[PDB]
Every structure is written in C-alpha cells, then in structure tokens.
Design a protein around this ligand. Structure first.
Ligand SMILES: Nc1nc2ccn(CCCCc3ccc(C(=O)N[C@@H](CCC(=O)O)C(=O)O)c(F)c3)c2c(=O)[nH]1
Ligand SMILES: Nc1nc2ccn(CCCCc3ccc(C(=O)N[C@@H](CCC(=O)O)C(=O)O)c(F)c3)c2c(=O)[nH]1
Ligand SMILES: Cc1ncc(COP(=O)(O)O)c(CNCC(=O)O)c1O
Ligand SMILES: Cc1ncc(COP(=O)(O)O)c(CNCC(=O)O)c1O
Lengths: 456, 459
C-alpha cells in the first residue's frame, strides 16, 4: 500500500458514483439558485495535501508547529477575500475558517451575543435562511433559535418585498441585539440603508448574509452591503463559484467620541470560530476559497456576474410571457421566485416532474399554507457557468413549461402527492413523454462545457 | 474561461504554496498524533464535482432534486461506516454529515440535551478535547461549555490514568445528562465498562469520542467502545486516514421493567441536530472521501497498518525510556506517547520550537502535575502519520535519536537564555546554534524524504 493508487483502480465502486454524478451535472439543467460548478483549479486545491495539516489557531497565534505554509495560505485567502470586495484592511477583517455558511452565522452570534440574546431575521417561508433564527409554531428548527431568542420579520404579502416598516415597528418592541439582512429565496435587493437605520435606532448589530449574492457584490454588479453592515457573512460556493466553505467579514478600526472608541469585533469573531465552535481548520478548503477569490477579482468574473443577471432577467421575462407570475415581479439578482399558483400546480410535484426530466429546482413557499408549497426557485449562476446566455435560458423556460404542462396533466388522474409521483413512473404513456422530454433536455445540456474535471 | 485549467497555470501563487506544503510534509518527521497522510483515492473524491451538489436533508427525505447519486454515496458511506466497525444495522446507525469532530460533538449535545444541561468530559490539560466541555477558571473556552454546563473529570496525577473513582463521586453530585469517554492526549485504553456503570447509575448518556483511536478500533487492534457506549463520535482524518469530516454513531432498537420494550430514540434527534438545526448543505465530496477511506479500513492492509501503529508507538516509547525520558502513565497502549520533559530540564514549549526548526513537528502537552501554562512540561508524539510512510520500529528509534539531539540543543540554549522569547530568538540569531540546527534539520529531512508518501505527487 502506498496511498498513491488511483481512485478508479482502488475503489471502482466509488469511482463509478463519481462519474454518474459528473454525468448528471453535465446532462442536466442545474437551476438551483445556490448551486454552482466549481473550477478545476479550486478542486485541485480542495483535494490536496492541505487536508493533512492540523493548523489550529490563527496566523502567528497557532498551537502546533510546521504551520509556516498554511499561515501564508490563510493570510493570502484573507487578503484575497478583502480585495474581492474592495475593502480597506484597516477598516475590515475577514475570518476564512468557517466550514460553511451555517457555522459562520452561528460563530457571529456566539461571538457577539450571550445565549438567549435576541436576533431578528427574515422568516423561512418569506425567503430567509434557517440560520437566521427560524422556529416554527410547533418546534425550534435551527440552533440559532435554540441558543438565541429569535423573532422573524416578514414580507408584505401584497408587495412581495420586505416589510421594512413592520420590521422597524417590531424591532423597538422586541429589542434585538442583532438583525440579519440576508436571504436565501428573494429576488430583489435589500435596502441595507434602511436596515442600518433600524439597527441604529434599536442599537442592534447589522449582519448581512450575502451568501446568495456574494459573487454579484464582488463583481461590483449589485450594491454592496459592506457600506452599512458591521458584520458580513457569506458562503464561498453559490455565486462566488468556490468550494463549500464560509467567511465572516467584520469591521475593525475606530467606531465612534465622548471626550476614539475602537471596534471590538475581531478578537470575538476569531475566538468564536476557534476554539469555541470549530476545531481544526480545513486548509484544503481555505486554499480552494482563495483560488476562487482570485478568480473573483478578474474581469471575466465581472462579465460572468453581469451575465447571470441578464439570464435571470431573461428567465423572468420568458416565464412571465408564458403565463407564469413571479413573486415581487421579476428579479434583480441571480434567482427568480416563480409563483405556480396562477397555473393550478404547486411547487411540490412540479419539482418532481422537472427532476424526472433532468431539470433541478426546489419548491419554495410563496406569500398560502403544507407539503404542497406555492412555486419554485430557479437559479442562473449554475448554467451561466456553462456560458448560458439569454437565448439559452429562454429554451430553459420552454423546457420547464413543457414539464409543467405534463405536471398539470398528471394531476388529471391523481389526487394528492403520492398519487402523482406513482403515476409518473407507472403508466407507460406518462413515462414516455417524460423520457422523450428527457432526451431533448439532456441533449441540449450536454452540448455546453462543464467547469472542473472531465470524469469526476 | 472554461473552469478546466490546471491550478499551476490558473493560480501560480497558490500552486507554489501547495507545493511548499507538500515538500514540508515529504521532508518532515510529522509526529502530531492527530495528523495523517490521506490517500490519493480519497483526495480524488474530496476534490470532485460533488462539491457542486446542494442536497440538504437526508437520503429519501431530501428537499432537493437531482440528489439520486449523492444519496447512493451517502448510503454507501453509512454502510461502509457500520461495516468498518462491525455494527449490526439493526442496532446501530451513523450520520455522515458532520463537517468535523467539533460539529459532530456539538450535534450530539444539541440532539440529546437542552441548553445548560450538564456534561462531563476529561479536562483539557488532562487529555480531553475542547468539545468535551472545556472551561478555564477565567473564561468559557469551548462553546460546549457555553450552551451547556460542563464539569470536567481529571486524571490521577500519580498514575497518569483517568480517576474513574473521582469521576463516579463527582458525577453523583453534579448529575450530568451525558458523559464523554474520549481523549485528545491519552496514551492508555479507556475503561468504557466503568464509564458505562457511572453513566447507568446517574442516568447519563455515554458518548464515546473515539476520534484519535478510530482507526485502531476499526482494525480491532484495541477494545471497541461500541460495546458500552450509546453514542459514538469520531473524526475521519486521524487514525482512519481519510479526509477531514465527522461521524455520529448511535444505537437503535430496544433501549423492558414492569410489563413494554423501551425503544432507542437517538436516530431522529441526532439526524435533526446535524440538519437543519446546526449544519446546512452536507459536503458530499467530504462524505465520498470518507467512504473511500472507510472501504480501506476494512482491508487486511489497514489492520497491518494499525498493528504497525501500535508497534511503532511502543518502539518510540521504549526508545524514549532508554534515553532517560519519563512518560505519562509509563508507556502507551495506543498510537501516541506523552513525553514528560520536566525531569530533563526542558519544557515542552522550548522543545516544540527546536524540534519544529529541524523539521520534527510535535505539540507541547501539559503534564498531570503542572500549571506553568505558558511552558507545559511535556510533549505529545504520534505514530500514525509516519507509519503511513511505511516507518517501522527501528525507523521510530531513529526518530527518537533525532528528538534526543533536539532536546540536547534546546537544553544548551536554555542555559544561555533567560525568558522564552530569548530562547526562540537565540535559535535564529546565534550563529553556532543556527548552524547546529541546520545540520540536524538536514539529517532529519534526508532521512524522511526516503520514505513513500500517500496522496498526490506534487500537491
Ligand atoms: N428561503 C429559504 N429557502 C431555502 C432553500 C433551501 N433552504 C435550506 C434547506 C431548508 C430545509 C428545511 C429543513 C427544515 C424545515 C422545517 O421548517 N421543519 C422541519 C420539522 C418541523 C416540524 O417539526 O414540524 C422539517 O420539516 O424538516 C424546513 F422548512 C426546511 C432554504 C432556506 O433555509 N430558506
Ligand atoms: N489534551 C488536548 N490536546 C490538544 C491538542 C490540540 N487540541 C485542540 C486545540 C486546543 C486549542 C486551545 C486549547 C486551550 C486553550 C485555552 O485554554 N485558552 C485560554 C488560556 C490561554 C492562555 O494560556 O493564556 C484562554 O483563551 O483564556 C485555547 F484557547 C485553545 C487539544 C485538546 O483540546 N486537548
Ligand atoms: C477527541 C477529539 N474530538 C474532536 C477533535 C476535533 O475535531 P475537528 O478538529 O475535526 O473539529 C479532536 C482533535 N483535536 C485536535 C488534535 O488532537 O490535534 C479530538 O481529539
Ligand atoms: C443566505 C444563506 N446563508 C447561509 C447558508 C448556509 O450555507 P451552508 O448550507 O453551506 O452551511 C445558506 C444555504 N442556503 C441553501 C440554499 O439557498 O439552497 C444561505 O442561503
């Protein structure tokens, strides 16, 4: 044994699964708003020998030896992170050790708040993420709602946009210590200036979770939350097109003067990441993130982010011009909140019909009330990374419309949901129409190239 | 831009750093008991297209489309995890989504306990991990001591062993809901039966954190904690020789007395704590790499590796004893050795720095009878990393020879230096000391480069 044998030679069962998943991504229309195809450069660093190094601590303040190289890799990733978002190192610092977005947010709350302190985030059916403090009326869901006290703010159901007024009213009553200005299913731009006004009045922290729009902010394509927020959290995949990781941007320097009150975020943020919450940093992921952060400063990323908008706007217009209404009307970022209620089909079996035909999306709750949500959430960054353009996404919408029409035609002879999915696999007529649409769907997708490796 | 360009061509600055770290691992004597060299087969999965797949949920209960393949990968990883540790799927389940060991242990507490519920783990300077509830006299360190209330149990300093008697006493008074049987720096086997009796008495969950010893357990070269614990966590990048990830093993089936088969209620609570409570999207590339190394653990090659890991740690221990060094608990029964350097006049902080400068990576370790904090009197030395490089018993005796020279050099510097900052500065400025280190470093690196290295060739 050497440990240098190939995966195909040593573990062929796993290697086959790699090729199947690689073929599924190549043959399919990936429309999940949070997915993206990582570049081979970053994947080579993700599966590197950096996995072998225990480097707990921070550059200069580490606990082991032999960390001289990972210190430079972490510092480079920190430096590349600040300039992908045009930040002054004297005003902003970044932590690159969060394992993902969920751990990154939990580190922010642990750093700045005591247990049971109050947070306010956008509710989950209203577009906010789990880690913004989601608890239903029956059960505490996210640990952000267990270890901290959470009251959600909602959208205006007539407007489809964030009810900034109701937020401000409930904010002085609830008195949160931190408000999260970040979304997972929201097509408009967040008024960070209005968020900072609410935060300055109730004397809370303004955390911006830019996970979904991190690439659009890096490319100076949409307005940046760094102008108003004290702490910014992000995933490194999604629009940043990197490995699965997380980052925590914090403000450093002087804050305010009663007679130079400094910012006290850095030491708390860093201590919450390690040793409070996480153990050993994943240096292979940190390097893959630095690779993608370098690609974010390049002019091709500005052209890439600009293309994701145009194709998200094209997908929005194409869906409107086929009858589909969209929550908030259209989009301003990378995703489209489609409303399938004015069509007679939910978001549940509509996803199952599209999934059966190599089109990946997810059900999304629209401004209704169970297992059959309102519409779906369609994303552009994934396919745009295969040089999809406006005309390409118009075929995507038409391919989706055919799936919806089959979905409306299976609710024909089915009752609930199990009746639906069983018919799509049982009756020979429905399966062939789905299979026929699959060959045409997979044929259109395979033609575009795929970032990353070739067979895995 | 195609996203298919090599790292060397796309990012030469990062590619140089990847190669410098690769060279540092090839040329160094890596003795960090928690480090290992991951096989290239697992690294291929770790850096694959599985990084792109958002599949939040669990196989069969996924909230995403197109998760057909990653569900098979997770299912295979689960079956390989139970097979590697000889577990009946009717009485054991495993969650393969913890990002690391710390998120694995936090998920267990969140699943089974309420905020501020009580846990007991081995204190950190005694060999327990941070995530076992570590809290100093000044500050709550680990978040497991913030969201939950922790009281540590300690070693008997005269034996270096866990004071199971004092644990049983303090647990009757503290009344923990969960006790952690697992260590970061402990050279002996843990009495899981005694831990089970203490837990059964005070009605506490027995969590076994076998992170350091997992590879030894899977190879059945040391007693398995699964015969006694309710919950078992581990990292997958130590003696298991896989990518950095975590696992949570939990019991299933019947946990009666009057009348009434009481069931185990771990599966749903554990899975819910990982997702959606704590974590988000599972890292399928990590899950796949873990599955690859898990298949490697079932092979006769891995049992020979694990047996060699035991032989080499004992060889390192015997070689250290023969040279005048004292060991916590007088030896070892697993993969590491806790060297006490106080009876030689050099603290672990000074020895760690000198060894690091001659490409011998270890970490200082607190000895059971000390409180210098800034200058721990000991060192933790591990065998799994170099054993993967096909080191043998006499190869580790040669390692101890290089260690002995570094200690002697560090001893000479201490006599000519005052504080510790003067020590670290003397090792780089003093021409004679800088030269003596350079010769030892070169002899160490030449010896280490001759051995094979798992993984890729250049990165
Ligand atoms: N806008 C937004 N969009 C998306 C898309 C994916 N995600 C992230 C993945 C979300 C998956 C998820 C997990 C749990 C629940 C939940 O609420 N309850 C529990 C049990 C409740 C009970 O006991 O009744 C359950 O049913 O699983 C849930 F609604 C969703 C999000 C997100 O976070 N936000
Ligand atoms: N046996 C064991 N061994 C190892 C080896 C690595 N690890 C995991 C990494 C351990 C990292 C660590 C440990 C302690 C403190 C701490 O006590 N800090 C206090 C006092 C600081 C001071 O001396 O001034 C403070 O911050 O105030 C800390 F901050 C960070 C462990 C482990 O867990 N156990
Ligand atoms: C028992 C135990 N639990 C958890 C962890 C940490 O898991 P992650 O680092 O993957 O989060 C360690 C490693 N502790 C560091 C060391 O021994 O060097 C450990 O020994
Ligand atoms: C805004 C936001 N913040 C944090 C996270 C957490 O990231 P991880 O799952 O990598 O921990 C997500 C994931 N959102 C999943 C989705 O939108 O489909 C997110 O959308």
């Amino acid at each position: 044994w050497t440990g240098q044998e190939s995966l195909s030679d040593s573990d062929p069962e796993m290697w086959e699964l790699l090729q199947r998943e690689k073929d599924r991504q190549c043959r399919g229309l990936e429309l999940i708003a949070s997915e993206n195809f990582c570049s081979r450069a970053a994947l080579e660093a993700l599966g590197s020998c950096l996995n072998n190094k225990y480097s707990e601590g921070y550059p200069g303040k580490r606990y082991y030896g032999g960390a001289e190289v990972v210190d430079e890799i972490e510092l480079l990733c920190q430096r590349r992170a600040l300039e992908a978002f045009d930040l002054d190192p004297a005003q902003w610092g970044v932590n690159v050790q969060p394992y993902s977005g969920s751990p990154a947010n939990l580190a922010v709350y642990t750093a700045l708040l005591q247990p049971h302190d109050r947070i306010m985030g956008l509710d989950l059916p209203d577009g906010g993420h789990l880690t913004h403090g989601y608890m239903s009326d029956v059960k505490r869901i996210s640990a952000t709602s267990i270890f901290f006290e959470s009251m959600p703010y909602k959208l205006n159901p007539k407007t489809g946009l964030i009810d900034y007024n109701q937020l401000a009213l409930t904010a002085r009553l609830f008195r949160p210590r931190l408000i999260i200005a970040g979304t997972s299913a929201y097509a408009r731009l967040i008024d960070y200036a209005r968020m900072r006004e609410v935060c300055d009045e109730v004397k809370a922290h303004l955390l911006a979770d830019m996970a979904h729009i991190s690439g659009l902010v890096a490319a100076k394509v949409i307005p940046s939350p760094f102008k108003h927020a004290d702490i910014v959290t992000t995933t490194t995949h999604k629009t940043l097109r990197g490995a699965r990781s997380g980052l925590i941007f914090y403000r450093k320097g002087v804050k305010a003067d009663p007679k130079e009150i400094p910012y006290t975020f850095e030491d708390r943020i860093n201590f919450a990441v390690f040793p409070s919450l996480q153990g050993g940093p994943h240096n292979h992921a940190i390097a893959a993130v630095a690779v993608a952060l370098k690609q974010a400063c390049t002019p091709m990323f500005r052209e890439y982010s600009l293309q994701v908008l145009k194709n998200a706007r094209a997908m929005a217009d194409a869906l409107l011009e086929r009858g589909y209404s969209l929550v908030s009307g259209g989009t301003d970022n990378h995703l489209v909140l489609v409303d399938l209620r004015p069509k007679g089909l939910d978001g549940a079996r509509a996803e199952r019909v599209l999934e059966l035909v190599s089109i990946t999306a997810n059900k999304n709750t629209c401004p209704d009330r169970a297992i059959t949500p309102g519409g779906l959430r369609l994303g552009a960054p994934a396919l745009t990374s295969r040089q999809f353009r406006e005309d390409d996404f118009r075929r995507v919408v038409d391919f989706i419309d055919e799936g919806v029409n089959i979905g409306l035609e299976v609710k024909s002879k089915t009752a609930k949901l199990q009746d639906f999915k069983s018919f799509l696999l049982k009756d020979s007529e429905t399966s062939q129409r789905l299979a026929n649409l699959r060959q045409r769907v997979e044929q259109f997708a395979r033609a575009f190239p795929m970032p990353g490796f070739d067979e895995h």
